[PDB]
Amino acid sequence: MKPTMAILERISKNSQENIDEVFTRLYRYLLRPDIYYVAYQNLYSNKGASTKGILDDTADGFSEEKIKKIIQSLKDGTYYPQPVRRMYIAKKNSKKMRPLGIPTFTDKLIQEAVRIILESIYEPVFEDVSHGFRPQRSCHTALKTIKREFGGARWFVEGDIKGCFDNIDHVTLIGLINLKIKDMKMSQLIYKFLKAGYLENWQYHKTYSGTPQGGILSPLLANIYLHELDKFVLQLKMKFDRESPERITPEYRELHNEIKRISHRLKKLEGEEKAKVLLEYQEKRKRLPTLPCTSQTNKVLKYVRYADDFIISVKGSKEDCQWIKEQLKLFIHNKLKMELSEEKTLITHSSQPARFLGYDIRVRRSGTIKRSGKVKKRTLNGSVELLIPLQDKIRQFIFDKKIAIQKKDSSWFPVHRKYLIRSTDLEIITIYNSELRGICNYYGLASNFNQLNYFAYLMEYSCLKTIASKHKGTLSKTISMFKDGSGSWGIPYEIKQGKQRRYFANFSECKSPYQFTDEISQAPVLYGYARNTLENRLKAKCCELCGTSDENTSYEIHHVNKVKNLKGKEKWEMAMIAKQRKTLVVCFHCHRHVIHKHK
RNA sequence: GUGCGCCCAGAUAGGGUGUUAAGUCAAGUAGUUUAAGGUACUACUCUGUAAGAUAACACAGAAAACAGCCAACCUAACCGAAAAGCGAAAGCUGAUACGGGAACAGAGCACGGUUGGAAAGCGAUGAGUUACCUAAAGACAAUCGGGUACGACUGAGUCGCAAUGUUAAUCAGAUAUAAGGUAUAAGUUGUGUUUACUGAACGCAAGUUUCUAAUUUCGGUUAUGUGUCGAUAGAGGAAAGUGUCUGAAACCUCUAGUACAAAGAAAGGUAAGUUAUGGUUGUGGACUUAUCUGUUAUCACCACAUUUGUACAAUCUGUAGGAGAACCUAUGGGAACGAAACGAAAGCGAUGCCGAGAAUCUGAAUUUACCAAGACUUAACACUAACUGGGGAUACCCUAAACAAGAAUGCCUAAAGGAGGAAAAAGGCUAUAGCACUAGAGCUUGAAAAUCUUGCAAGGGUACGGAGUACUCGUAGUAGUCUGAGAAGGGUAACGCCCUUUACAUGGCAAAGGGGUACAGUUAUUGUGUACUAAAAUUAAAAAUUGAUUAGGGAGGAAAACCUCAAACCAACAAUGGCAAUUUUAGACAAUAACAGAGCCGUAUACUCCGAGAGGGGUACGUACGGUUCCCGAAGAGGGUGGUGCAAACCAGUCACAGUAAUGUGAACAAGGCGGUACCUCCCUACUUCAC
RNA sequence: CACAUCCAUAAC
């Protein structure tokens, strides 16, 4: 009959085909409970699952009967999502709080389902220039887009919108949805989420090392709003550009044409008077790469957007670059009701560093003349060349985590992190290899990535001074205790296969600025394509520590996040070390007596 | 829970410190002197100066001692125990029998001792094999072509430092709070490091040790030898510097790693100051000073990077700033234009203390003018220790001493006879099957020697490691004037002080370790307080109603334009109306439970290291007594009166089955009993390693 | 463009 998940894929082709359909009758799909399994095939890969909203309902309970206790309450307009619990936290290096949000498990499975319906309709309407909270797009696709078609632009518009994600209008958002979805009971389910919700966002930009992925925490809602801007300026791109004929300058064509008249003469004679005209060939060559092959009267705008930033590269004047900053204020006022901050829409001319996603971003004008071998272009003119901010960002990291020390000649000398003596030699290197591999993998596109050598010096020699103090040893005895047999140093464990070693991270295996690893590798699980999942053990109705296959006892989910905190002396922790999984079933009689023996 | 470490007393059981006073000891050789002075002179002998080559005359030296270093041997204190006694074991005791044997700290408290002159460590090293790169880009062949101190792997064979220290000989004075040093607690949290608390016992003062910098290659290069594209050097390489055939007139190494001039100019080596430190206080490298006998003859020369200025180019040289780059000033390239790390901090002051040569000058100073102070040996005096002699109230282990206390065992012949007729278990007894018991099993046999349950005189062991303020016991004796005053003064200083007076045998700390009680402080529990004063930002203030608002209902299976379906209503800011622990205004406390050492300062006293000294670092906070905040230990192990289930199994009749009772019994996780394990606990314990 | 050493050893 197409079980619901082929009907949703039937729509995600349907938006692409009709270039404007008013998509009606979307509510009837949330109720057949087959899509409420892909919601449970999503909610296992999110970090923040222990913090709760106001009621004490723990983040589990995945049972087909509360599917009815869901889906029947989705019927008579009697599901109303939770009010606010403001357990405050503030952004790095600043005194600002941006409100933080969480539901009860119920809401997470409707929300994670109204995400999938709304992701079916809007995803082939999201324009290419957005790269924020999407599939198959991340931080690095934005950077890579800058490294191609931003190349060679005279000026920047390095925008900011004054709290763009707490200023989100709860009333003209829903007016925009209801151009597309012409459905009545959908919006009221959405508008239970707006004003009975929160505004529910974070600050920790360094969690993915320069990303607001925690540091904005929402579904796609924020993108649906902004897509009216990403529709506007890619409409502004056609009013702006007027493409002129002249690309190679007329100062350049008088020198470009006279090369071929005398290069045709160089082969007609070699000898002594060849060398005399070779001086008016080779010393005349000294203003040939000083002559440039580009013209700055043609007019070209670009646009890139992540979630809340956007950067706009324009081929023109500063007259022009203060007209684009004009016809944005006429917009984010009138059609989105927000202030594009005149303080911090920094126009910075391009040859100066911008700042977009934690990179410094700029065009090269340093007129060096390399070889490309027998052929020769200027490979460094007009190339957008991304850069770490070593002075803002890595300087901050090195001192925020207490690696280093400024010395009296300003030289940073590394010492031990005081609070890490309390773990093993394997725990500390896994502390430190994790931190180093994050920044380097973040900053792998950086044209001065080689410069992170100072940072990886400091990390490596401060990992060893921690392990030094715990053993009561020195920095030299600790490479001599942890010797190999090839001059490198490692950390041993006895595990089942014989001895291995933990080494330290690197460059060529954190650098690669074309390929990378696509889910941030914080002990990643496999794709369980052998039916080990959280859906076909539900149908087994099984009892592992239970023995009685009873219907009046509720089956559910016992998914806690972490497994390293389980000790193995109590009755419940001996099952999770055997099957090696975050989760199992939980009973109606099993949870309340065996887990809750003390409390 | 750091080897010792209590409290009073004594001073060789082993020792330490100080004081005088005798005796002896050794200064290259002689001389003079006194004297058995010692370095002063005189004369010779040997050595030292390569500070960047050798010789000739002047400056420094020449012993013995103790104190230390290093190495190899032999042996006190310590070990599972020999061994050995001991209600037999609970625990105690090891002249020497092996094991270490300088031990782990000498820092309060011995390892010693002979013999020799030298090891860790740290920089400059072969072997012993790399694995690699090889001046030709590569292909060709250890072509020792021709490196192997390229670093490996190797674990120590060569050179340097480590490898010394102390001991009187011109006297007094002069810029004596002189420069210049040193103390002036510790900690908590103010994190904008803004002038803040605590018996801080100092005062002022918010921005300071600190970097952003080198010009006739001092680039896009670390916080290093290096290694690579430019301007800029192409003649070897395109008949191998050993060879072969090449790529190209392209290919490597330096010079073009400076346009003048000044000087020093490699190595060792002296003494200062650094970095080395790190987390506080003392031994190797490497920077930086300065210093290494004057004069003659061969000897006396080519550097080279900076010390020095420019000298011009120069990148693109902070930058505040207006400025598509090869665009515009200006203190010009520390020149606040900016940046990063760092609290009653950096600095400056104020007080009491230290202040060598005897600064350099001034009078030195008179038979070289004066010197008695090293080390041992003996005596006398003074002191002194955590050493030595004395001195001992709670919890744990033990249980012999029938020491005090409850356990004595069968029936039938027929109670008469007794079981002394018979049997024979039972308390018993040996091994150890075995799963505790049954002791098997002949057996004293028919309560003793083994039922538990306690204990003095008992026998052991541990606690003498500071947290808050009041009481038991050995004693106010073990101390005759308490080092905490007796007792009063006496300021001080925070005190207890030490200073002045003064009491006479209860006059004195109230000798020791550990208990006990009353109220405190923190943590983990457990229950509740919740008007001692009620009303509020207003959290319970989407309620209701609302506002006369608003477009919008309810239970299910199709793609989107739309298949179907059974056939007068929730929601749209809030507003408005009582309270709860309290920020808005006040005459969260109960209840139980347990309990640790970071120091620091004052006087006394014991030690050591760095310093000329003042002082600083440590020794359990060194210890004691006075003061003070900070602060409120972890983990395993056994043990359990007290906890419980399960496979086996205990035993006659709790069970059959008869029997002279016991006896063969097939059947008790029907455990009548209860171990054997598993579990959660709950409790005790420096038992064991940690932590200071 | 740049791979990375020496950071000593020893008073509680």
Nearest nucleotide from residue A23 CA, by C1' atom: B560
> Would you call A159 helix, strand, or coil by DSSP?
coil
Residues 6+ apart with CB under 8 A from A21: A14, A15
Cβ–Cβ under 8 Å, residues A445 and A147:
yes
Whether any strand C atom is under 7 angstroms from the Cβ of A474: the reply reads yes
Whether any strand C atom is under 7 angstroms from the Cβ of A477: the reply reads yes
Residues 6+ apart with CB under 8 A from A449: A388, A440, A443, A507, A511, A513
What is the domain partition of chain A in residue ranges? 4-122+167-200, 250-287, 390-511, 525-599
Total residue count of chain A as it appears in this document: 599
- Gap from A428 CA to B29 C1', Å: 76
Residue nearest to nucleotide B561 (CA to C1'): A21
Whether any strand B atom is under 7 angstroms from the Cβ of A188: the reply reads yes
- Measure the CA–CA gap between A156 and A598, rounded to whole angstroms: 62
- Gap from A549 CA to B394 C1', Å: 61
Whether any strand C atom is under 7 angstroms from the Cβ of A450: the reply reads yes
A108 is written with which tokens? 């997470």
Cβ–Cβ under 8 Å, residues A305 and A129:
yes
- Gap from A409 CA to B52 C1', Å: 37
A158 backbone dihedrals φ, ψ, rounded to 5°: -90, 70
Nearest nucleotide from residue A487 CA, by C1' atom: B152
CA distances from A235 to A19, A240, A246, A302, A303 (A): 16, 9, 25, 11, 11
Cβ–Cβ under 8 Å, residues A88 and A100:
yes
Whether any strand B atom is under 7 angstroms from the Cβ of A376: the reply reads no
Whether any strand B atom is under 7 angstroms from the Cβ of A454: the reply reads yes
Q: What is the CA radius of gyration of chain A?
A: 30
- Gap from A206 CA to B649 C1', Å: 68
Residue with tokens 């931190």: A435
Whether any strand B atom is under 7 angstroms from the Cβ of A447: the reply reads no
Nearest nucleotide from residue A249 CA, by C1' atom: B324
**Nearest partner of A318 among A289, A288, A348, judged by Cα:** A348
- Gap from A273 CA to B30 C1', Å: 100
Whether any strand B atom is under 7 angstroms from the Cβ of A453: the reply reads yes
- Gap from A197 CA to B33 C1', Å: 115
**Nearest partner of A235 among A121, A324, A315, A174, judged by Cα:** A324
Q: Which of residues 480-539 of A touch strand C (CB under 7 A)?
A: 507
A102 backbone dihedrals φ, ψ, rounded to 5°: -160, 145
Distance of CA A341 to the CA centre of its chain: 24
Nearest nucleotide from residue A453 CA, by C1' atom: B222
Q: A507-515 long-range contacts, Cβ below 8 Å, gap at least 24? A: A507/A440, A507/A449, A507/A450, A507/A452, A507/A453, A507/A456, A510/A436, A510/A437, A510/A440, A510/A441, A510/A444, A511/A440, A511/A444, A511/A449, A512/A444, A513/A444, A513/A445, A513/A446, A513/A449
- Measure the CA–CA gap between A65 and A62, rounded to whole angstroms: 9
Query: Where on strand B do bases come within 7 A of a protein Cβ?
Result: 151-153, 209-212, 222-223, 229-230, 278-279, 316, 323-326, 340-342, 552-562, 570-574, 680-681
Whether any strand B atom is under 7 angstroms from the Cβ of A296: the reply reads yes
A366 is written with which tokens? 């340093």
Distance of CA A234 to the CA centre of its chain: 23
- Gap from A375 CA to B521 C1', Å: 86
Cβ–Cβ under 8 Å, residues A501 and A491:
yes
DSSP A308-334: S-EE--EES-TTGGGTTTHHHHHHHTT
Whether any strand C atom is under 7 angstroms from the Cβ of A453: the reply reads yes
- Gap from A568 CA to B643 C1', Å: 23
- Gap from A83 CA to B31 C1', Å: 117
- Measure the CA–CA gap between A269 and A496, rounded to whole angstroms: 77
- Measure the CA–CA gap between A42 and A404, rounded to whole angstroms: 41
Whether any strand B atom is under 7 angstroms from the Cβ of A501: the reply reads no
Nearest nucleotide from residue A290 CA, by C1' atom: B326
Whether any strand B atom is under 7 angstroms from the Cβ of A71: the reply reads yes
What does the angle CA A293 – CA A294 – CA A299 come to, to the nearest 5 degrees?
165
A322 is written with which tokens? 């203060």
Nearest nucleotide from residue A476 CA, by C1' atom: C7
**Nearest partner of A463 among A441, A436, A499, judged by Cα:** A436
Nearest nucleotide from residue A17 CA, by C1' atom: B560
Whether any strand B atom is under 7 angstroms from the Cβ of A31: the reply reads yes
The structure was resolved experimentally with: cryo-EM
Expressed in Å, this structure's resolution amounts to: 3.2
Whether any strand B atom is under 7 angstroms from the Cβ of A47: the reply reads no
H helix count then E strand count, chain A: 18, 10
- Measure the CA–CA gap between A184 and A174, rounded to whole angstroms: 12
CA distances from A137 to A126, A334, A439, A558 (A): 12, 30, 19, 33
Residue A380's Cβ-side half-sphere holds a number of Cα atoms within 13 Å equal to 10
Residue with tokens 């696709």: A141
Q: Which of residues 576-595 of A touch strand B (CB under 7 A)?
A: none
Whether any strand C atom is under 7 angstroms from the Cβ of A479: the reply reads yes
